[PDB]
Design an enzyme around this catalytic site. Structure first.
Site, PDB file in Angstrom:
ATOM      1  CG  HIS B 126      26.762   7.041   7.334  1.00 49.28           C
ATOM      2  ND1 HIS B 126      25.680   6.765   6.531  1.00 49.28           N
ATOM      3  CD2 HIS B 126      26.280   7.629   8.452  1.00 49.28           C
ATOM      4  CE1 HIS B 126      24.584   7.220   7.133  1.00 49.28           C
ATOM      5  NE2 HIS B 126      24.919   7.750   8.297  1.00 49.28           N
ATOM      6  CG  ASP B 156      27.904   3.477   1.077  1.00 41.16           C
ATOM      7  OD1 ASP B 156      28.133   2.957   2.193  1.00 41.16           O
ATOM      8  OD2 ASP B 156      27.314   4.581   0.906  1.00 41.16           O
TER       9      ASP B 156
HETATM   10  C1  LIG Z   1      27.593   7.317   2.840  1.00 38.94           C
HETATM   11  C2  LIG Z   1      26.274   6.913   3.480  1.00 38.94           C
HETATM   12  C3  LIG Z   1      26.243   5.409   3.698  1.00 38.94           C
HETATM   13  O1  LIG Z   1      27.264   4.850   4.129  1.00 38.94           O
HETATM   14  S1  LIG Z   1      24.673   4.615   3.417  1.00 38.94           S
HETATM   15  C4  LIG Z   1      25.078   3.178   4.472  1.00 38.94           C
HETATM   16  C5  LIG Z   1      24.683   3.333   5.953  1.00 38.94           C
HETATM   17  N1  LIG Z   1      24.987   2.144   6.721  1.00 38.94           N
HETATM   18  C6  LIG Z   1      24.253   1.035   6.579  1.00 38.94           C
HETATM   19  O2  LIG Z   1      23.317   0.960   5.748  1.00 38.94           O
HETATM   20  C7  LIG Z   1      24.593  -0.127   7.489  1.00 38.94           C
HETATM   21  C8  LIG Z   1      23.367  -0.893   7.965  1.00 38.94           C
HETATM   22  N2  LIG Z   1      22.288  -0.026   8.435  1.00 38.94           N
HETATM   23  C9  LIG Z   1      22.394   0.754   9.508  1.00 38.94           C
HETATM   24  O3  LIG Z   1      23.416   0.832  10.213  1.00 38.94           O
HETATM   25  C10 LIG Z   1      21.144   1.568   9.820  1.00 38.94           C
HETATM   26  O4  LIG Z   1      20.103   1.142   8.934  1.00 38.94           O
HETATM   27  C11 LIG Z   1      21.396   3.107   9.735  1.00 38.94           C
HETATM   28  C12 LIG Z   1      21.729   3.527   8.294  1.00 38.94           C
HETATM   29  C13 LIG Z   1      22.576   3.479  10.642  1.00 38.94           C
HETATM   30  C14 LIG Z   1      20.169   3.948  10.160  1.00 38.94           C
HETATM   31  O5  LIG Z   1      19.665   3.552  11.481  1.00 38.94           O
HETATM   32  P1  LIG Z   1      18.088   3.590  11.787  1.00 38.94           P
HETATM   33  O6  LIG Z   1      17.497   4.804  11.175  1.00 38.94           O
HETATM   34  O7  LIG Z   1      18.079   3.303  13.242  1.00 38.94           O
HETATM   35  O8  LIG Z   1      17.427   2.331  11.030  1.00 38.94           O
HETATM   36  P2  LIG Z   1      17.493   0.794  11.441  1.00 38.94           P
HETATM   37  O9  LIG Z   1      18.224  -0.046  10.458  1.00 38.94           O
HETATM   38  O10 LIG Z   1      18.047   0.735  12.809  1.00 38.94           O
HETATM   39  O11 LIG Z   1      15.940   0.389  11.466  1.00 38.94           O
HETATM   40  C15 LIG Z   1      15.018   1.032  10.527  1.00 38.94           C
HETATM   41  C16 LIG Z   1      13.620   1.076  11.112  1.00 38.94           C
HETATM   42  O12 LIG Z   1      12.684   1.341  10.041  1.00 38.94           O
HETATM   43  C17 LIG Z   1      11.609   0.418  10.151  1.00 38.94           C
HETATM   44  N3  LIG Z   1      11.067   0.115   8.827  1.00 38.94           N
HETATM   45  C18 LIG Z   1      11.745  -0.252   7.693  1.00 38.94           C
HETATM   46  N4  LIG Z   1      10.969  -0.463   6.662  1.00 38.94           N
HETATM   47  C19 LIG Z   1       9.698  -0.219   7.149  1.00 38.94           C
HETATM   48  C20 LIG Z   1       8.437  -0.266   6.537  1.00 38.94           C
HETATM   49  N5  LIG Z   1       8.248  -0.585   5.258  1.00 38.94           N
HETATM   50  N6  LIG Z   1       7.363   0.041   7.308  1.00 38.94           N
HETATM   51  C21 LIG Z   1       7.554   0.364   8.594  1.00 38.94           C
HETATM   52  N7  LIG Z   1       8.690   0.437   9.276  1.00 38.94           N
HETATM   53  C22 LIG Z   1       9.739   0.133   8.486  1.00 38.94           C
HETATM   54  C23 LIG Z   1      12.190  -0.831  10.797  1.00 38.94           C
HETATM   55  O13 LIG Z   1      11.119  -1.576  11.334  1.00 38.94           O
HETATM   56  C24 LIG Z   1      13.099  -0.186  11.830  1.00 38.94           C
HETATM   57  O14 LIG Z   1      12.291   0.148  12.950  1.00 38.94           O
HETATM   58  P3  LIG Z   1      12.800   0.038  14.492  1.00 38.94           P
HETATM   59  O15 LIG Z   1      13.397  -1.380  14.769  1.00 38.94           O
HETATM   60  O16 LIG Z   1      13.704   1.236  14.621  1.00 38.94           O
HETATM   61  O17 LIG Z   1      11.615   0.539  15.258  1.00 38.94           O
HETATM   62  C25 LIG Z   1      25.037   7.526   2.838  1.00 38.94           C
HETATM   63  C26 LIG Z   1      24.636   7.336   1.521  1.00 38.94           C
HETATM   64  C27 LIG Z   1      23.499   7.996   1.024  1.00 38.94           C
HETATM   65  C28 LIG Z   1      22.724   8.848   1.822  1.00 38.94           C
HETATM   66  C29 LIG Z   1      21.567   9.626   1.293  1.00 38.94           C
HETATM   67  C30 LIG Z   1      21.784  10.560   0.268  1.00 38.94           C
HETATM   68  C31 LIG Z   1      20.755  11.349  -0.225  1.00 38.94           C
HETATM   69  C32 LIG Z   1      19.492  11.243   0.318  1.00 38.94           C
HETATM   70  C33 LIG Z   1      19.258  10.355   1.358  1.00 38.94           C
HETATM   71  C34 LIG Z   1      20.289   9.569   1.856  1.00 38.94           C
HETATM   72  C35 LIG Z   1      23.194   9.022   3.114  1.00 38.94           C
HETATM   73  F1  LIG Z   1      22.504   9.851   3.972  1.00 38.94           F
HETATM   74  C36 LIG Z   1      24.294   8.389   3.633  1.00 38.94           C
END
Ligand SMILES: C[C@H](C(=O)SCCNC(=O)CCNC(=O)[C@H](O)C(C)(C)COP(=O)(O)OP(=O)(O)OC[C@H]1O[C@@H](n2cnc3c(N)ncnc32)[C@H](O)[C@@H]1OP(=O)(O)O)c1ccc(-c2ccccc2)c(F)c1
Ligand SMILES: C[C@H](C(=O)SCCNC(=O)CCNC(=O)[C@H](O)C(C)(C)COP(=O)(O)OP(=O)(O)OC[C@H]1O[C@@H](n2cnc3c(N)ncnc32)[C@H](O)[C@@H]1OP(=O)(O)O)c1ccc(-c2ccccc2)c(F)c1
EC number: 5.1.99.4
Lengths: 359, 359
Positions: B126, B156
Site C-alpha cells: 500500500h 495513492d
Molecule cells: C492506502 C491503501 C492503498 O495504498 S490502495 C493501493 C494498493 N496497491 C495497489 O493498488 C497496487 C496494485 N495492486 C495490487 O498490488 C493488488 O491489487 C493488491 C491491492 C495488493 C491486492 O491484491 P489481490 O487481492 O491479490 O488482487 P490482485 O491485483 O492480485 O488480483 C485481483 C483478482 O481479482 C480478480 N478480478 C478482478 N476483477 C474481477 C471481476 N470483475 N470478476 C472476477 N474476478 C475479478 C482478478 O481476476 C484477480 O484474480 P486472481 O489472478 O487472483 O485469481 C488503501 C486505500 C483504500 C482502502 C479501502 C478503504 C475503504 C474500504 C475499502 C478499501 C484500502 F484498504 C487501502
C-alpha cells in the site's frame, strides 16, 4: 523532442513551486517549454534541477518591448502558465483577455493557492497555509503532538501542479472539438481537497474521525505504521488485508492466538506493544530479507541517500545521475512515445532566436 | 455532461485507491465513466462517494460472457483503467495486446505501486510501502521520532492517480497526431519520486539533508511549521520570505532585534521557543483575525468538521453538501466548459444498456 507531448508549445512566466513543477513535467513528456524570467534575477546556468527541459529567456515585462515580445510568444503557443497573485498578469497586460486577442487557442493556466477570488485571494502563502485551511494538515502527525507538515508534497505538487497539468491537458482535449482555448483556474486549496477525497468519503460513513493518530491510515492502526528496529532504522507496515497481516505475523514469529484481533481497536495498545517488541528485536535489513517477495507489506524505510542502492529502484531506472545528485526520471511511462532523459537547465537564449525557430 | 472532457469514454476495472480516484476526476470533468466491478461485491448503492460520476456494472470477467461483454465496452471506449497486479488483466484476456485487437486507439492505463516489471512487481503493498522505498516516508515527521505516514496522499493520489491522469491525457493529445493509442505505466514509486523532485534538486545543491526535522519545509524551520495556541488548537506558519517573516514578527509583538536570525539554523531551537511562547499567549481564532489580509503566512489549522464554516471555503464553493456530509467539488476550474456538481454513485445498471447507449 521525445514523448507524447511532442509539438506542444508552452510559455511559463517564472514563478516558484507548483508553476515550475507543472512546466517541468510538460517538458519531461516532450512539450516545448519556454520560460520567461525577469532579468534582475538569472545569473549564469541555473542550479535548480526543477528547471530542466526548458529554454530560459530574459525579458523585463515592465518595459513596453518586454510586454510585446512576451505577447508574440504567447500568440505562437498552446499554453501559458503563470503562478502570480490574481491581477498581476492583467496589470502587466499579459492577462487572459489580452491573450485571447492574439491567440484564441491559448490554454491560460493560472496556478494559485487561494484561487482567483475571495477573501484570501491576495494573501501570501505557502503549501502549509493552503493545507491548513481545508482540514488536511490537521490530520497529519501523532495524536499527542501538533500536526506535522508533509513537506510541500500535498499542496504545491499533489494538489497544485498536478491539477494544473490535468486542467491544461483536459483543456487541450476540449480544444479538439470547439477549436478554442480557455482559462484554467488551478487552486491548491481546491486540488488538495480533491486529493483527500477518500477521507471526506470515509468521514461521511463513520470510517474516519477528526482525531489525529486514531484512524486506519494516519498511523493509529498498528498494522499501518512505521516501526523502529534494533539498529534505530525503520520499516513500514501496510498489512491491511487480513491475509497480508497473517503473513506478517508469521514472519515476526508471533502466533495469532497470543495477540488481540487485528481490528479490535480497544486492544490496539496491547497489539502495538507486541509488534513494537517484535520489530525492535532485529535490524531493518533483517526484516528486509525475511519479507522480500512476501505479501506481508513490510518494506525498509530508506533515506534519500540509500535509494540509489535499492534493486527495484535501479532496475526500473526510476532515477538518473546529473551533477553530483540523482533525479527522478519522468513519469508516467509510455509504451510507444517514450520520454527521454531530461536535458539539464539550458543557459539563457534571446527571445528573438525563439520567435524565429517558432515558424 | 458538463466539463472539458465531455464525451471522453472511460472503462474502469474496479480496484482500490489510485485507479478509482483517477476515474473520479475524469468523471468530475465530464467524462463518461463505466466501472466494471465483480457481481459478488455490489449490494445496494455503493456508499463510497469516490464512486461518483460513474455508471456501475457487474460482470464475472472470468466467465466467457463477462469477458465478451467487457471487450465490447472497451472497443467503444477511449481509455481503460486497471489497477491490478501485473499479469492479472493478461490472464483475464483483457491484456493490452487483446484490447489493441478490438481498438488500436485505446489508451491503456495501468496503475500500480511498484510498476509492471522488476523484483517487487508481484509484491502486495500500500501507499506507505511505495513511499518507504524512495526516500519520501523517511523525510516526514519529527526528528526525535519515527516517520509518520502522510495519510495516503503522496503514493495513492499525489504520486499515483494524478500521474495516471497526466498520462491518460498526454496520450490522448499524442493520439490526435498519430491515430493510435498506447500503454501508460503509472507506478506510484515513480510518480511520487517526481512529485518530490524539489527535494532531490535541493539535496543536489546542498540545501536538503536526510536528517528528519532539520530542513526548510519538513517542520524543522521555525517559520515553516505549526504552533500550539492558548486553547490547544493550532496555527500554521509559512513565512519563508524575509518580508512575510518580518510581518509575522510584528503581529506577534516581537522585536526583530531580540531574536536570532531567521535562517541561523544553529539557533532555530532558541527562535522556536520564543515564537512558541508568543503563539501560546492567545487562541487560534485570535491569530486568524490578527493576520487576515496580511502577508504574514499565518493561518488557522482547521479540522475537517470546521472547514464548512470558513469564509474563503464557503465563498469559492470548494465543497458541496451531499449524503452524510461535505465533499470536494471538482478541480481544477474551467472558464468556458465548467464542470458540474458530481452525481452520486449510479446504482447498478446492466452492461447491455450501456452498449445500446454507446451505439
Ligand atoms: C492506502 C491503501 C492503498 O495504498 S490502495 C493501493 C494498493 N496497491 C495497489 O493498488 C497496487 C496494485 N495492486 C495490487 O498490488 C493488488 O491489487 C493488491 C491491492 C495488493 C491486492 O491484491 P489481490 O487481492 O491479490 O488482487 P490482485 O491485483 O492480485 O488480483 C485481483 C483478482 O481479482 C480478480 N478480478 C478482478 N476483477 C474481477 C471481476 N470483475 N470478476 C472476477 N474476478 C475479478 C482478478 O481476476 C484477480 O484474480 P486472481 O489472478 O487472483 O485469481 C488503501 C486505500 C483504500 C482502502 C479501502 C478503504 C475503504 C474500504 C475499502 C478499501 C484500502 F484498504 C487501502
Ligand atoms: C513551499 C513554497 C511554496 O509553497 S511555493 C507556492 C507559493 N504560493 C504561490 O505560488 C501561490 C500564488 N502566488 C503568490 O502568492 C505569490 O507569487 C507569492 C509567492 C506569495 C508572493 O510573491 P510576490 O513577491 O508578492 O510576487 P507576486 O506574485 O504578487 O508579484 C510578482 C511581481 O513580479 C513582477 N514580475 C513578474 N515577472 C516579471 C518580469 N519578467 N519582469 C518584471 N517584473 C516581473 C510582477 O509584475 C509583480 O510585481 P508588482 O505587483 O510588485 O508590480 C516554496 C517552494 C519552493 C521554493 C524555492 C526553493 C528553492 C529555490 C527557490 C525557491 C520556495 F522558496 C518556497
Amino acid at each position: 523532442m521525445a514523448g507524447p507531448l511532442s509539438g506542444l508549445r508552452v510559455v511559463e512566466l517564472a514563478g516558484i513551486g507548483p508553476g515550475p513543477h507543472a512546466a517541468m513535467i510538460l517538458g519531461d513528456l516532450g512539450a516545448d517549454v519556454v520560460r520567461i524570467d525577469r532579468p534582475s534575477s538569472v545569473d549564469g546556468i541555473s542550479r535548480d534541477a526543477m528547471l530542466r527541459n526548458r529554454r530560459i529567456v530574459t525579458a523585463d515585462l515592465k518595459s513596453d518591448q518586454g510586454l510585446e515580445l512576451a505577447l508574440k510568444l504567447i500568440a505562437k503557443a498552446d499554453v501559458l502558465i503563470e503562478g502570480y497573485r490574481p491581477g498581476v498578469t492583467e496589470r502587466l497586460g499579459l492577462g487572459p483577455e489580452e491573450c485571447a486577442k492574439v491567440n484564441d487557442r491559448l490554454i491560460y493556466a493560472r496556478m494559485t493557492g487561494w484561487g482567483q477570488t475571495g477573501p484570501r485571494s491576495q494573501q501570501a502563502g505557502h503549501d502549509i497555509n493552503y493545507i491548513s485551511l481545508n482540514g488536511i494538515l490537521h490530520a497529519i502527525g501523532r495524536g499527542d503532538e501538533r500536526p506535522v507538515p508533509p513537506l510541500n508534497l500535498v499542496g504545491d505538487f499533489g494538489g497544485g501542479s498536478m491539477f494544473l497539468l490535468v486542467g491544461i491537458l483536459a483543456a487541450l482535449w476540449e480544444r479538439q472539438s470547439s477549436g478554442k482555448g480557455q482559462v484554467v483556474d488551478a487552486a491548491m486549496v481546491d486540488g488538495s481537497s480533491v486529493l483527500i477525497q477518500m477521507m471526506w468519503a470515509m468521514r461521511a460513513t463513520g470510517m474516519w474521525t477528526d482525531t489525529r493518530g486514531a484512524n486506519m491510515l494516519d498511523g493509529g492502526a498498528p498494522y499501518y505504521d512505521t516501526y523502529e528496529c534494533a539498529d534505530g532504522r525503520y520499516v513500514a507496515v501496510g498489512a491491511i488485508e487480513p491475509q497480508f497481516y497473517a503473513a506478517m505475523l508469521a514472519g515476526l514469529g508471533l502466533d495469532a492466538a497470543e495477540l488481540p484481533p487485528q481490528n479490535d481497536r480497544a486492544r490496539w495498545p496491547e497489539l502495538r506493544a507486541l509488534l513494537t517488541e517484535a520489530f525492535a528485536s532485529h535490524d531493518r535489513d533483517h526484516w528486509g530479507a525475511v519479507f522480500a517477495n512476501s505479501d506481508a507489506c513490510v518494506t525498509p524505510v530508506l533515506a534519500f541517500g540509500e535509494v540509489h542502492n535499492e534493486p527495484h529502484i535501479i532496475e526500473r531506472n526510476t532515477f538518473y545521475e546529473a551533477n553530483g545528485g540523482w533525479q527522478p526520471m519522468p513519469a508516467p511511462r509510455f509504451s510507444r512515445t517514450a520520454s527521454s532523459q531530461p536535458r539539464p537547465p539550458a543557459a539563457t537564449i534571446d527571445i528573438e532566436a525563439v520567435l524565429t525557430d517558432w515558424d
